[PDB]
Amino acid sequence: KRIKGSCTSILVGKKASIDGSTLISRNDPGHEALDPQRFVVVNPEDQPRDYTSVISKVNVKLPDDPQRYTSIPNSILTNGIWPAAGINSSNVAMSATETITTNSRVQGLDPFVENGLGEEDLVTVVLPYVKSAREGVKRLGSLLEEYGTYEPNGISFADNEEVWWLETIGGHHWAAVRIPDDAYVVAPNRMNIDQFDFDSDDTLCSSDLKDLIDNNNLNPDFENYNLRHIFGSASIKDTVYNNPRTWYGQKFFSPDDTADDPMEQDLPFICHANRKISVEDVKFVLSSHFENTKYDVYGSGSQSDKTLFRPIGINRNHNVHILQIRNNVPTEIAGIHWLAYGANTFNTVVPFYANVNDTPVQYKNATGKFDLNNMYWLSCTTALLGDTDYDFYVDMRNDYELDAMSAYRKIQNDTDADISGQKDIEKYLENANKKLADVAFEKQNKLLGDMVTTGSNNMKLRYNLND
Amino acid sequence: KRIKGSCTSILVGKKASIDGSTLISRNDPGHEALDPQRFVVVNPEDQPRDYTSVISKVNVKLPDDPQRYTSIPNSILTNGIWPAAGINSSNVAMSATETITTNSRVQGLDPFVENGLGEEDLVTVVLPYVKSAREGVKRLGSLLEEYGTYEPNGISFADNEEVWWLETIGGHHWAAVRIPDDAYVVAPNRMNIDQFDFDSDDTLCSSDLKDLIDNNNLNPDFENYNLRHIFGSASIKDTVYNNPRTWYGQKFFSPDDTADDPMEQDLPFICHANRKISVEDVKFVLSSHFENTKYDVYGSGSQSDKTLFRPIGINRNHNVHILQIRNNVPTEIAGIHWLAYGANTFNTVVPFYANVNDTPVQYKNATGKFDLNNMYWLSCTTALLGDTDYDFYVDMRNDYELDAMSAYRKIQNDTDADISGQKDIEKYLENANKKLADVAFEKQNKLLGDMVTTGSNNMKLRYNLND
Numbered sequence A, B: 001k002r003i004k005g006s007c008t009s010i011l012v013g014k015k016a017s018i019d020g021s022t023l024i025s026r027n028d029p030g031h032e033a034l035d036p037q038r039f040v041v042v043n044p045e046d047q048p049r050d051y052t053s054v055i056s057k058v059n060v061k062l063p064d065d066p067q068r069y070t071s072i073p074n075s076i077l078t079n080g081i082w083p084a085a086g087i088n089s090s091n092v093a094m095s096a097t098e099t100i101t102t103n104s105r106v107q108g109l110d111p112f113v114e115n116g117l118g119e120e121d122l123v124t125v126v127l128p129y130v131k132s133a134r135e136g137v138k139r140l141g142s143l144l145e146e147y148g149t150y151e152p153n154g155i156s157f158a159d160n161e162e163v164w165w166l167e168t169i170g171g172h173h174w175a176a177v178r179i180p181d182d183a184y185v186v187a188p189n190r191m192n193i194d195q196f197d198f199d200s201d202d203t204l205c206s207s208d209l210k211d212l213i214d215n216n217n218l219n220p221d222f223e224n225y226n227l228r229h230i231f232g233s234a235s236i237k238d239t240v241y242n243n244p245r246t247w248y249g250q251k252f253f254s255p256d257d258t259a260d261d262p263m264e265q266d267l268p269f270i271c272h273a274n275r276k277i278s279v280e281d282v283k284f285v286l287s288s289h290f291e292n293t294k295y296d297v298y299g300s301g302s303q304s305d306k307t308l309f310r311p312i313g314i315n316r317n318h319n320v321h322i323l324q325i326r327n328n329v330p331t332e333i334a335g336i337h338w339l340a341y342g343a344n345t346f347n348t349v350v351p352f353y354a355n356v357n358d359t360p361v362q363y364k365n366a367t368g369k370f371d372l373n374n375m376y377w378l379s380c381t382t383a384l385l386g387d388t389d390y391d392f393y394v395d396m397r398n399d400y401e402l403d404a405m406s407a408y409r410k411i412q413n414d415t416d417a418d419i420s421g422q423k424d425i426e427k428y429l430e431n432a433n434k435k436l437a438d439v440a441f442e443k444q445n446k447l448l449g450d451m452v453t454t455g456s457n458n459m460k461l462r463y464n465l466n467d
């Protein structure tokens, strides 16, 4: 047995969002436990042409024309801080942090390959060599066929037009679905793809997948093809660890199409919300642990409805990551990395422009010993002070996030609105990303001050007396 | 009154399964507690021609042409280790470990015969002399009429075409139903056969059964014949000990045709699933404790709608045995003994080929004192280590079972795919069986290492903390 944790992905098609962007997202648990959030640029320079896989050490030959891409690194690993997600210079987004499920019937036919690729390799070997989400699908599929994989994975791709969800199937097979423009998906650590039309333009798969199913008695259904019925799981672990997370998201976006059983094994894959979806919505769902009277995590009653469902995106590590490819803006400022910051219950997402060659100084320094001029330690301070009397800080937490998002959006809007006469767009965007980093810091500083100010004024008469 | 245990049987017709096989199954009563369980081949020589019944010592003369059959034994008795189930060289499967019920009106007419056959005799005196599921039914019926029985029993027979369920009735009578091709049955320790057509090609019974009923006011119903209404029980014990097990299986396979009362006395015998049934499905149901939200064994809060409704297969004594006769392959490799291994919450089923003259060296040795090279002792260790922190080990346990099953199926598929050019099929299958026993061992060995490794690092920062 080995490594890896719990993740929830939300995909939004370009007509399903409030601003016409595509959205792919994820929340992330860490394995060891320090979470300084960094984002990194990988220039064609730094891209290997003879790549060696992280766990398996197999050697992979990569094309010689890699695109610059921005990367979001991860946990403790067995070989270097591999990219979990990213946006390349063609505005293609990819995220490969969603472990899914399988079953023993297909594994008996196409087993995990112990010397295969793992999810740690996927962004590196796919993202720099494709100019569309759909190319991302075909290239990854072709690489699974060639090198195999030792894991069950779900991978999201997006560009300004399309969103694709790819699922690996056994050691070498795969299947993928184009999310409709007006649709959204909530996907936990369980194989998600349901009804599947091999003919469709909206689908892609191993060229032998249908024959693989038909010739080996893999299909449990009397009619049609449901890929997660065929290749996935419907286990006991799913009902408490995966399905309630799907259910919760679908209850939020589609309250009138979603019944009341968080354990349901056949919640639809593709959904239609009753309204357009914002970045704030996605952030909330990826942050929120089922909270209305039902399933806190936790407080006032019940706990006969509790302890045994799985919180999102809290257990914790709490990093929400949202990749947005916008429309109706010049293509050079379209790619946005909404990066987590962080941390505890005081996390926000900061909208960095992805189209840059260098990063704000904060994300290459240390992050050595405690220093309140450093964003990490300031966050840790705010985090720790937060659990003092935490529902004395619950209402100033919501104001903090609101006020910080507001400040981030002001910068994004001002930057977008003044793009037209700029002679150096890349430096222009570097400067915006540095304004964002600065206000993210200033906001948490204002937060530390407000907590201490009102805390010292409450602790003062939690000690009881006088007029 | 005297000996015996709790059993649940599941029967699947050849069009009801995912792979075109017939399935008969049972989970296994603990006798006392010796649960290293054997796999045994019985050659025609070792078959008595003058058989002596186990308890009653009555003498039964058997034909002189017995077929080779594989047998699955037990522990404690007053005489030996009788075969509970088996597959013969004609690919007929039989299982006789399902005690049922009766009533005083039929017993008042045809009492149990104190010196008759009991379930310990049935496989031995039926299986070696029949070439079809249906012949097994006719022979058992004839043997009950002749020697009588002291018990109420349910017996399943299968070949590659048909599945039959026979129920003994009083001292000498019996009735049997052919399970339809597209149907399945969940049958606990209660007389199961309901609506009954004497005329039918799909039924067999005592030639006087209808007359017995009509002439003795045995029929409680205004119209037609329901055999368990007439001959069986609808008792208080049935509502908590039998019916919930039936209900649970029917909820799992036929969720939209099954209501929500587990105590229901009139759940149908024959059922139609909403999907095709896998070996994995059958294993899960025969293993599973009634879970989720309502009634575990045991759990959530608060424990009186959580009950005297009892777990199958937790009492505990979890040996799942599935007899499969495949179609889809040559007849020489069609009979599969899915055998338990085992044990505690750490059991899997291994698909041993039944068409062999010898058994893996595993099931011929001692079974002496503690030795970690022995499958039994290795199993006890992982089992005991399992109840330290039982849901620190539950998620690596679901992966253990999944991963072992996959490795088994890989071997099964490879063995099957290369059968046509084999010159010594018997030696070929013995070798495959030895691969299976080995990998099952190897897989349990890897589990011990993984359990100890993760255990050694979690209880170790019961430090209560810090990096």
Ligand SMILES: [Co+2]
Residues within 6 Å of the ligand: A199
């Ligand atoms: Co067509």
Ligand SMILES: [Co+2]
Residues within 6 Å of the ligand: A332
């Ligand atoms: Co350009």
Ligand SMILES: [Co+2]
Residues within 6 Å of the ligand: B180, B181, B182, B183, B272
């Ligand atoms: Co039918």
